């Protein structure tokens, strides 16, 4: 699928192109990416199935990110943007914002209202602090819920969640009460309460906490996921280790 | 629980000491660790519940690791060592080996035969290559197994596994056929075959692959777990991202 693409490209074989794009793995494409003329990068980001396109763009430089969000057709932008994880959308928007703040406003208007309001709260936080790294696509439950109710829930929430391997616990006010893992859930009795299984001394970070600290905290405790709260102690999101590895 | 310890320490209050150690979190202890006299580091590694002691020692420098494996009583060493994850045991043994190869042989003899043979294959690989980072404590299944059989299996394997969030697939010969996630398993129908759910294009690494490459591969694909094979394409272990974060 590697060069077997530049075959469809140099040729102008749309049929063959679309076919290779249906199964080309995002990383396989991100590889030979420096070896693609400008015209070809544009066509691929156009014809690629939207989810993969979002994936690719999410891994490009922010200057490249901003250039394609400014040159790709609005119908296509609509598609790519709605496929981005929230934290990746914010970074992609902030990329454009830096260059053209007016078009940033346009990009946000192309979003679905539910999506648009979410990024807005996000895109604001300092981009080198917990808020600028986190995503609100986590799973939270109450401590009164049983394991059976949570597992049932997770199957429903899985498709959109950043992860379901770490499940946070909150109260009526939305404040962090503890942490739970999919592993514990899987071995526990379906009748067991979540409070009888959670770890009440969950370690967390603030929305303004420096990214150095988030990285250090995640390396020390060996977490793959860390919760992020606001000034009122309420769960507002999670940071995952893949995004910490990138901060280096 | 922080300084509330140095209280039992400076006093010589074994009862109080053991009590604080029953609930002192490993990282909470690893913190005020530079602020502990030699005598106190020794007592804590002695009285701490074995699992936590293994945890603490696993995070100390390799020179400190080797000094305590040479000064702690054999009955206690027996306990700590059997609580270490395999990859951590190998590194702890290699630490001592560098200083005193003879005592390394003693340390290995204190292990349980099943444990001893396992570390031996491990402790040999280059410690800056996949082999020197991996652990054989992963979960593998066949592609003919159903989801129900795998979930049943995982509950049984959970307690010792490094993780059960990524389940590898092998054949009769033990060679890597694909990868699967706990997430997919949870949403899939219990009757579904594993081959109808796995990703056949699993990305993997060799036992001799450089650790730079393991880190890069894990950062690019955003994996939290990567499989490691030998020269015959057989699954011999996994590397987890927490150990890659440490390689920096
Ligand atoms: Mg961001
Ligand atoms: Mg992310
Ligand atoms: Mg090692
Ligand atoms: Mg490990």
UniProtKB/Swiss-Prot annotation, chains A, B:
The segment(s) forming the CBS domain are: 134-196, 198-248
Q: Which UniProt keywords apply?
A: Calcium, CBS domain, Cell inner membrane, Cell membrane, Magnesium, Manganese, Membrane, Metal-binding, Repeat, Transmembrane, Transmembrane helix, Transport
Q: Which residues bind Mg(2+) 3?
A: 91, 132
Q: Which residues bind Mg(2+) 1?
A: 55, 222
User: Which residues take part in binding Mg(2+) 4?
Assistant: 212
Question: What would changing residue 55 to A do, according to UniProt?
Answer: Still possesses a slight channel activity
According to UniProt, the reaction catalysed is: Mg(2+)(in) = Mg(2+)(out)
Q: Which membrane topology describes this protein?
A: Multi-pass membrane protein
Q: Where in the cell is it found?
A: Cell inner membrane
Give the residues the record marks as binding Mg(2+) 5: 219, 222, 246
Residues engaged in binding ATP = 166, 181, 183-184, 203
Q: Name one GO molecular function term.
A: protein homodimerization activity
On the tree of life, the source organism's domain of life is Bacteria
Give GO cellular component annotations, separated by semicolons. Answer: plasma membrane
Example GO biological process term? magnesium ion transport
Q: Hey, which stretches end up on the Cytoplasmic side?
A: 1-248
Instruction: Note how its activity is modulated.
Output: The channel activity is regulated via the N-terminal cytoplasmic region, which acts as a Mg(2+) sensor to regulate the gating of the ion-conducting pore in response to the intracellular magnesium concentration. Under high-intracellular magnesium conditions, binding of magnesium to the N-terminal cytoplasmic domain stabilizes the closed conformation of the channel. Under low-intracellular magnesium conditions, the channel is in equilibrium between the open and closed states.
Q: Which residues take part in binding Mg(2+) 2?
A: 87, 243
Description of how the protein assembles with itself and partners: Homodimer.
Report the protein's function. Answer: Highly selective magnesium channel that plays an important role in Mg(2+) homeostasis. Functions as a Mg(2+)-dependent gating channel. Exhibits low activity with cobalt, suggesting that it might also be involved in the uptake of Co(2+) as a micronutrient. Also exhibits low activity with Ca(2+), but it shows almost no activity with Mn(2+).
The family assignment reads:
Belongs to the SLC41A transporter family.
Q: What's the protein here called?
A: Magnesium transporter MgtE
Q: Which organism is it from?
A: Thermus thermophilus (strain ATCC 27634 / DSM 579 / HB8)
Placed within the complete protein, the shown segment runs 5 to 252 of 450
């Amino acid at each position: 699928l590697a060069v077997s693409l530049q075959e469809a490209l140099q040729e102008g074989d749309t049929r063959a192109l679309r076919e290779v794009l249906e199964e080309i793995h995002p990383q396989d494409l991100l590889a030979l990416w420096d070896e693609l003329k400008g015209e070809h990068r544009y066509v691929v980001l156009t014809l690629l199935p939207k989810a993969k396109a979002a994936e690719v763009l999410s891994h490009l430089s922010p200057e490249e990110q901003a250039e394609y969000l400014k040159t790709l057709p609005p119908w296509r932008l609509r598609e790519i943007l709605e496929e981005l994880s929230l934290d990746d959308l914010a970074d992609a928007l902030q990329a454009v914002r830096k260059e053209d703040p007016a078009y940033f406003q346009r990009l946000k208007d192309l979003l679905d209202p539910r999506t648009r309001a979410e990024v807005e709260a996000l895109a604001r936080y300092e981009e080198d602090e917990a808020g600028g790294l986190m995503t609100p696509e986590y799973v939270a439950v109450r401590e009164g819920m049983t394991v059976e109710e949570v597992l049932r829930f997770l199957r429903r929430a899985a498709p959109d969640a950043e992860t379901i391997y770490y499940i946070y616990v909150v109260d009526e006010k939305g404040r962090l009460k503890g942490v739970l893992s999919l592993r514990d859930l899987i071995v526990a009795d379906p009748r067991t309460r979540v409070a009888e299984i959670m770890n009440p001394k969950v370690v967390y970070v603030r929305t303004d906490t420096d990214q150095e600290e988030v990285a250090r905290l995640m390396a020390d405790y060996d977490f793959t996921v860390l919760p992020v709260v606001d000034e009122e102690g309420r769960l507002v999101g999670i940071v995952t280790v893949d995004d910490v590895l990138d901060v280096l």
